[PDB]
Ligand binder design. Structure first.
Ligand code: CHL
Ligand code: CLA
Ligand code: CLA
Ligand code: CLA
Ligand code: CLA
Ligand code: CLA
Ligand code: CLA
Ligand SMILES: CCCCCCCCCCCCCCCCCC(=O)OC[C@H](CO[C@@H]1O[C@H](CO)[C@H](O)[C@H](O)[C@H]1O)OC(=O)CCCCCCCCCCCCCCCCC
Ligand SMILES: CC1=C[C@H](O)CC(C)(C)[C@H]1/C=C/C(C)=C/C=C/C(C)=C/C=C/C=C(C)/C=C/C=C(C)/C=C/C1=C(C)C[C@H](O)CC1(C)C
Ligand SMILES: CC1=C[C@H](O)CC(C)(C)[C@H]1/C=C/C(C)=C/C=C/C(C)=C/C=C/C=C(C)/C=C/C=C(C)/C=C/C1=C(C)C[C@H](O)CC1(C)C
Ligand SMILES: CC1=C(/C=C/C(C)=C/C=C/C(C)=C/C=C/C=C(C)/C=C/C=C(C)/C=C/C2=C(C)CCCC2(C)C)C(C)(C)CCC1
Lengths: 218, 40, 148, 89, 220, 226, 74
């Protein structure tokens, strides 16, 4: 329920937003006298975007190892893919890491600028012709939750507003756990120097001798 | 642009331009025809 | 130097952008500016304290090993590049054996072990004629805890 | 806290310092969010502007568990290094 | 284009007021309000209808001579087709100094008439030059229609075809201008000239990108 | 109401159910514009009819002539009868004009429906072409559309959609294993776990390029080969 | 008494119209020049925000933004 909440935070936290535990110590979601990117709408919009990206990363920084070690293939750690060349690089890429980045930049431009234009100017990506996809790029009033025949392609939810609201709490919590995990992956990687999976499979072995305190020296 | 061009016309901007051209002209002249003491 | 220059120009464009943004766009109200207790609390710890600690990081990882090698007579174009000191613990450990333990001495409160990159020598370096870089690192570390 | 120093004088000193200083605020023997002080070092109470909501019976708030333990940590470090420098430790 | 609901540059962002949609290839793209002034618009439109047209001819040449040099046909690549010896003439041999002077002289005459009509519409159509009048008139700014500039009569014919043709010209011209920067930037990085760069990219498409060329990406 | 592609989905309005095989499957809303739906449909039907013929040829050719790999059968020497080592340029010439006529005629039926229906050379000979994409007449000799063509159209589109998916399988499982459609079934049934997509997706088995009568033809595997 | 970020959305518009009107900041120097003193006055009174307006909100916003530029040039 409420975690480290205060009367001031509750004034502007009434429960509506998916996943509102009244946890705003500094108080950044206060609407009174707001602007720029600190407006409550943008902050909530970013949190959802971070959760979705973190959930993809959290499941991507451990899958090459959980599967690669099992013998499926690849078997790299998330830092040895080409993200941070000084910490390692994979050799079998159909193209240059920078060449891939060039394509990545162009693709994100047509995907994150259209997404933005739908927040600044609600439902503006559905009018300009976009290979006929425009119709599926309309989105709903809420910027975080688009909808349409694409983003909600299997109409999961819609059976009552209660189900949408539970499915939105599931995501904001399965995503705040993933955001705390992604930070954990990076922090453990820096100190230990090994991959998330090996770090778990070492605590499991000798937990007392394999923790953050021991990892300070070892 | 009508009001930007108005600003680029104000005395300080026009003088900065005129002088830069005149200065560069003299510099370039000596660059190709150096040591011009007499008109020969 | 070229990379630093480029970074400074990028910062410059951020500053002017910030000036226009915090004036023509998100202009703070008077009640914001008159929070002196907040300004001092953030300028002492966040600005001065963290500013020194962040420097005590560079001085301890890049300036100390590079300067030690330069004063040792090593050619400038043969010193391991800064990042190699951070990643390759062996290189830093060779220059400062206290990197063989790690951050353990700090948490165990055995700071003494780090008495090879954090010292109170005092005076001037006999080779270069300037304050020891080790003493400067210890100063910025202390100055930081104070401000923070 | 590392290398299983648990049990070491340093561990005991730091734990004692942190606890002795958290039990100096939860037990009203020092300034805290609410019950501040005065120009004569007397707790004259205080209104916090955020209105922190605490479940602790005495009203000890997170602000006060991160503001007394920090004092204990600084005190412990000062004592540990001080005794360490002397023959005490 | 040619519509109030014409496709725009940044779908969503509203189009500039000065850019109504009539002008050929109008997509409401003037972020730094360079054509905020109406007179500036006319000049900028004419200038674009000048750079693009020359760029289109220039691109046709860098591609035709290049295609020739690749097939084998003796054709100096665009970069080295200036040091190539100037051909002789029935009158005499060509000199670089005379060639440049003659090129500017002729251009000054045409430019003067074009700009003079631009500043004073129909000024050139005064039978002053050998009685040529309407042919020296301008159908539109950047559109000097007549029986000397539009001989086949696309402008005199269906306006819809003329309008469609106007869009083709603007879009193709903008592409040629971008293409020209390529021909120059690919040269000042690869040193090979196009049609050799298209041939290298089609032989090892994955390991022959801008990233792997030394100059484009410095670190890589 | 028709059964849709997912138990929780709601059909897009434009997909009211008129077209055969309308399972309301337009997640990207590509068929929203009625002009595009019309065109895309003709493309679906052409793609289906071509893949159903193709998936029959690959399977059939293997069953009868098993020496020739489906992937490597367009080579002049591979061509059977006298066709062996026949000038591919001359062959292309035939496949070109002949295909251009049939395609352009079909395209003009899109541009102006029921316009190109009468024999251009002779006369009177015309095709009913009741629906765009369903000419019938000489195209339907044994006359089976005379019945419930819509029901037959539903079977045709559904069979074609399965084929379209199947022919692209034949393509991948051939450039990975190097063997034909039924040979890949045989290998699996020999040792299932050891003859799977796991032990075969890490190699693009098929030439990088093929020189055809002096014309080198570059080749590529759909997935970047490991 | 709450310490919080307080901001006013899009107060001053970004335009060059004021750029073309020298002395728009001072009521006295907005009337244009009639003596050669105005030239020296529009410079000796351009950073004196307190003189431009009586609002301490605007004077502060100007000061805060000015500092930014200074940092930029530094
Ligand atoms: C309008 C665009 C234009 C562009 C992009 C180029 C580009 C180039 N010209 Mg060039 N030219 C152009 C117009 C013209 N050129 C020439 C006459 C020449 C000559 C005689 C030569 C070049 C050469 C060159 C190449 C080497 C430049 C050099 O070394 O400086 C010399 C540049 C010039 C003499 C003129 C450049 C004009 C801009 C280069 C790629 C050189 C070449 O062939 O490279 C191997 C060369 O020898 N150009 C004329 C007629 C006077 C031009 C227009 O009228
Ligand atoms: C003295 C410098 C200064 C100060 C006091 C402020 C103050 C403020 N800015 Mg601001 N800004 C600055 C410089 C400054 N800015 C510069 C140089 C830029 C150009 C990049 C910006 C761009 C900017 C934008 C786009 C926005 C603000 C906003 C705000 C307001 C709320 C956000 C905030 O800062 O709260 C606390 C901090 C945060 C909420 C997020 C912190 C994110 C930073 C960038 C991460 C690191 C900061 C730290 C200094 C880094 C240290 C070095 C690092 C290696 C550790 C606030 C009053 C927001 C606003 O207008 O509110 C209405 C807003 O939208 N600023
Ligand atoms: C979802 C992210 C993802 C990504 C980016 C990759 C990427 C890659 N995988 Mg892979 N894989 C994934 C998920 C992923 N995989 C999952 C979830 C499984 C479990 C079913 C597998 C099982 C798998 C196997 C058995 C193999 C690969 C292989 C490969 C490499 C060659 C792929 C190829 O050409 O064959 C086609 C693609 C695949 C076989 C799997 C990728 C398909 C994913 C789901 C999305 C595409 C490549 C770098 C091959 C390899 O290791 O190279 C030697 C190989 O043998 N993967
Ligand atoms: C980049 C676009 C832009 C535009 C179109 C405007 C437009 C405007 N601004 Mg503005 N401003 C901008 C950017 C911009 N600003 C930025 C990036 C900052 C942060 C520094 C500011 C900070 C700012 C303040 C504080 C104020 C304005 C004001 C104004 C309005 C009238 C004053 C004016 O600008 O006249 C033209 C002014 C100048 C041409 C002076 C130029 C000074 C610049 C910032 C740097 C020059 C320093 C110089 C190099 C020093 C060295 C000189 C030496 C080499 C000899 C006007 C509509 C004033 C206002 O709101 O109206 C009352 C106001 O007080 N602006
Ligand atoms: C840890 C928090 C923190 C930090 C590090 C700073 C740091 C700074 N503040 Mg500041 N301030 C803060 C909190 C903080 N402030 C709060 C909470 C308030 C409201 C009570 C204010 C109100 C305030 C005012 C009114 C002013 C400053 C100013 C300054 C700058 C001093 C001028 C200088 O020496 O330039 C040196 C430059 C550097 C050392 C390079 C660092 C510059 C970075 C980009 C500044 C970023 C600060 C900001 C908090 C980070 C978030 C930005 C993000 C939203 C994008 C300095 C960099 C002055 C200023 O704006 O100068 C331009 C000034 O006028 N602050
Ligand atoms: C069992 C408790 C205990 C003991 C035995 C010691 C013992 C010692 N402390 Mg210490 N200290 C303690 C608790 C203790 N401390 C606690 C709880 C704190 C936290 C507030 C500190 C914080 C502290 C600091 C910051 C320093 C010491 C220092 C010292 C050493 C020299 C003190 C001195 O003469 O300074 C010098 C006396 C002067 C008059 C010079 C200071 C004058 C300047 C200009 C002010 C000494 C061995 C000093 C040290 O480390 O020396 C190496 C020192 O830096 N202590
Ligand atoms: C090129 C083949 C092709 C084409 C042109 C179409 C066209 C169409 N289909 Mg369709 N479909 C196909 C193949 C095709 N389909 C296959 C193989 C299946 C089996 C899964 C289906 C199953 C299917 C269903 C269940 C439904 C449709 C429907 C529709 C219509 C909806 C409008 C639309 O979104 O159009 C756009 C479609 C295209 C432009 C096809 C191109 C494909 C896009 C551009 C990328 C797809 C790449 C693909 C994933 C690669 C597969 C590789 C794999 C086989 C290995 C439309 C006219 C709906 C309908 O019947 O409405 C009447 C509908 O309910 N189709
Ligand atoms: C250098 C080019 C600067 C941009 C320009 O000239 O036009 C800039 C144009 C016109 O610039 C000015 O605009 C202001 C009104 O917005 C003024 O009042 C005038 O209309 C005009 O002079 O406006 C912009 O597009 C803003 C560009 C900012 C960069
Ligand atoms: C509430 C509150 C209130 C008060 O007032 C104030 C405050 C306190 C401030 C607040 C809080 C806040 C917070 C907590 C935050 C956090 C964050 C995070 C951690 C994020 C993550 C975040 C994270 C993330 C995104 C992640 C991402 C990732 C990604 C994309 C990807 C990755 C990867 C993978 C897959 C694999 C490969 O091979 C590689 C790569 C590619 C590399
Ligand atoms: C509907 C929808 C809607 C939304 O909106 C979106 C989306 C979802 C995207 C969509 C989807 C789509 C799809 C799925 C498509 C598919 C396609 C295909 C697969 C085709 C094939 C296709 C295929 C095909 C044609 C095939 C072909 C083949 C052929 C001709 C032939 C072959 C062969 C044989 C016989 C044998 C010999 O010896 C050889 C050869 C000669 C080689
Ligand atoms: C009984 C009770 C409880 C408990 C609670 C707790 C657990 C508390 C604790 C708390 C804490 C846990 C405290 C502590 C704190 C500490 C801290 C937070 C730290 C800080 C740090 C600082 C402040 C700094 C330091 C430094 C460094 C880093 C460097 C050098 C110098 C010096 C040393 C100064 C519960 C609820 C469960 C239940 C019911 C009742």
């Amino acid at each position: 329920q409420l975690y480290f909440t205060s009367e001031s935070t509750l004034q502007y936290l009434d429960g509506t937003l998916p996943g509102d535990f009244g946890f705003d110590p500094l108080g950044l979601l206060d609407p009174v006298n707001s602007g720029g990117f600190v407006t409550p709408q943008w902050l909530a919009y970013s949190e959802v975007i971070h959760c979705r990206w973190a959930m993809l990363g959290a499941a991507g920084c451990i899958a090459p190892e959980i599967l690669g070690k099992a013998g499926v293939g690849v078997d790299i750690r998330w830092f040895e893919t080409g993200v941070i060349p000084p910490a390692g690089t994979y050799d079998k890429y159909w193209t240059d890491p920078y060449s891939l980045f060039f394509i990545e930049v162009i693709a994100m431009q047509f995907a994150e600028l259209r997404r933005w234009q739908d927040f600044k100017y609600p439902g503006s990506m559905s009018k300009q012709y976009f290979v006929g996809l425009e119709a599926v790029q309309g989105g709903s009033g809420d910027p975080a939750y688009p909808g349409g025949p694409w983003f909600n392609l299997f109409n999961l939810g819609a059976k009552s507003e209660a189900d949408m609201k539970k499915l939105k709490l599931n995501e904001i919590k399965n995503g705040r756990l993933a955001m705390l995990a992604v930070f954990g992956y990076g922090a453990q990687a820096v100190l230990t120097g090994k991959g998330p999976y090996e770090n778990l499979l070492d605590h499991l072995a000798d937990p007392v001798n394999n923790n953050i305190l021991t990892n300070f020296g070892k | 642009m009508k009001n930007f061009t108005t600003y680029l016309s104000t005395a300080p901007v026009v003088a900065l331009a005129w002088f830069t051209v005149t200065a560069a002209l003299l510099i370039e002249i000596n660059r190709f025809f150096p040591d011009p003491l007499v008109f020969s | 130097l070229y990379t630093t220059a480029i970074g400074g120009l990028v910062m410059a464009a951020a500053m002017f952008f910030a000036g226009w943004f915090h004036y023509h766009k998100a202009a703070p109200k008077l009640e914001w500016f008159q929070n002196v207790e907040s300004m001092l609390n953030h300028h002492l710890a966040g600005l001065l304290g963290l500013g020194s600690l962040s420097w005590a990081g560079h001085q301890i990882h890049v300036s100390l090993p590079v300067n030690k090698l330069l004063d040792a007579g090593v050619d400038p174009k043969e010193i391991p590049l800064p990042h190699e000191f951070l990643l390759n613990r062996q290189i830093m450990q060779d220059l400062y054996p206290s990197f063989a333990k790690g951050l353990a001495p700090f948490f165990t409160l055995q700071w003494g072990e780090y008495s090879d990159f954090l010292t109170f020598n005092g005076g001037l370096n006999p080779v270069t004629g300037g304050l020891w870089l080790s003493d400067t690192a210890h100063h910025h570390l202390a100055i930081a805890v104070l401000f923070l | 806290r590392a290398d299983g120093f648990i049990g070491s004088t340093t561990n005991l000193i730091m734990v004692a310092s942190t606890a002795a200083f958290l039990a100096a605020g939860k037990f009203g023997l020092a300034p805290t969010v609410k019950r501040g002080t005065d120009a004569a070092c007397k707790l004259v109470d205080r209104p916090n502007a955020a209105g922190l909501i605490s479940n602790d019976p005495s009203g000890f708030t997170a602000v006060d568990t991160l503001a007394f333990g920090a004092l204990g940590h600084i005190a412990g470090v000062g004592i540990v290094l001080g005794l360490r420098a002397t023959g005490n430790l | 284009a040619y519509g109030p609901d014409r496709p725009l540059w940044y779908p969503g962002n509203p189009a500039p007021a000065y850019l109504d949609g009539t002008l050929a290839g109008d997509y409401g793209f003037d972020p730094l309000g360079l054509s905020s002034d109406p007179e500036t618009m006319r000049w900028m439109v004419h200038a674009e209808l000048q750079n693009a047209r020359w760029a289109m001819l220039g691109a046709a040449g860098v591609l035709l001579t290049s295609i020739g040099a690749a097939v084998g046909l003796p054709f100096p690549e665009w970069y080295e087709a200036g040091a190539a010896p100037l051909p002789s003439t029935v009158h005499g041999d060509w000199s670089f100094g005379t060639l440049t002077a003659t090129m500017f002289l002729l251009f000054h005459w045409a430019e003067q008439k074009r700009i003079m009509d631009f500043r004073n519409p129909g000024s050139q159509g005064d039978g002053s030059f050998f009685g040529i009048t309407d042919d020296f008139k301008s159908k539109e700014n950047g559109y000097p229609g007549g029986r000397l500039f539009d001989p086949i009569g696309f402008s005199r014919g269906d306006e819809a075809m003329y309008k469609k043709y106007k869009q083709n010209e603007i879009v193709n011209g903008r592409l040629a201008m971008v293409a020209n920067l390529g021909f120059w930037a690919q040269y000042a990085a690869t040193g090979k000239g196009p049609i050799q760069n298209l041939a290298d990219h089609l032989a090892d498409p994955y390991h022959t990108t801008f990233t792997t060329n030394g100059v484009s990406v410095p670190f890589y | 109401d028709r059964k849709l592609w997912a138990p929780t989905v709601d059909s897009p309005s434009y997909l009211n159910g008129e077209l055969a095989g309308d399972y309301g499957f337009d997640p990207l809303g590509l068929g929203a514009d009625p002009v595009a739906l019309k065109w895309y449909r003709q493309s679906e039907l052409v793609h289906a009819r071509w893949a159903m013929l193709g998936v029959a040829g690959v399977l059939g050719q293997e069953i009868l002539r098993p020496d020739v790999f489906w992937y490597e059968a367009g080579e002049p020497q591979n061509l059977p009868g006298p066709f062996q080592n026949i000038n591919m340029g001359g062959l292309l010439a035939w496949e070109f004009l002949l295909m251009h006529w049939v395609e352009v005629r079909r395209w003009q039926d899109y541009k102006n429906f029921g316009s190109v229906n009468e024999d251009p050379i002779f006369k009177g000979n015309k095709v009913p072409n009741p629906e765009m994409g369903y000419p019938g007449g000489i195209f339907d000799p044994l006359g089976f559309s005379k019945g419930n063509r819509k029901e037959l159209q539903t079977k045709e589109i559904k069979n074609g959609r399965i084929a379209m998916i199947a022919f692209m399988s034949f393509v991948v499982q051939a450039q990975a294993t190097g063997k034909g459609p039924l040979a890949n079934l045989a290998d699996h049934l020999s040792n299932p776990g050891a003859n799977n997509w796991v032990s075969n997706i890490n190699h693009c088995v098929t030439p990088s390029s093929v020189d055809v009568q002096g014309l080198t033809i570059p080749l590529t595997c759909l997935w970047p080969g490991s | 008494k709450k310490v919080k970020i307080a901001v006013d959305r899009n107060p001053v518009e970004t335009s060059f119209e004021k750029w073309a009107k020298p002395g728009h900041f001072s009521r006295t120097l907005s009337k244009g020049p009639n003596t050669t003193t105005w030239i020296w006055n529009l410079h000796a009174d351009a950073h004196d925000f307190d003189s431009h307006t009586s609002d301490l909100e605007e004077i502060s916003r100007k000061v805060f933004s000015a500092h930014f530029g200074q940092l930029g040039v530094i």
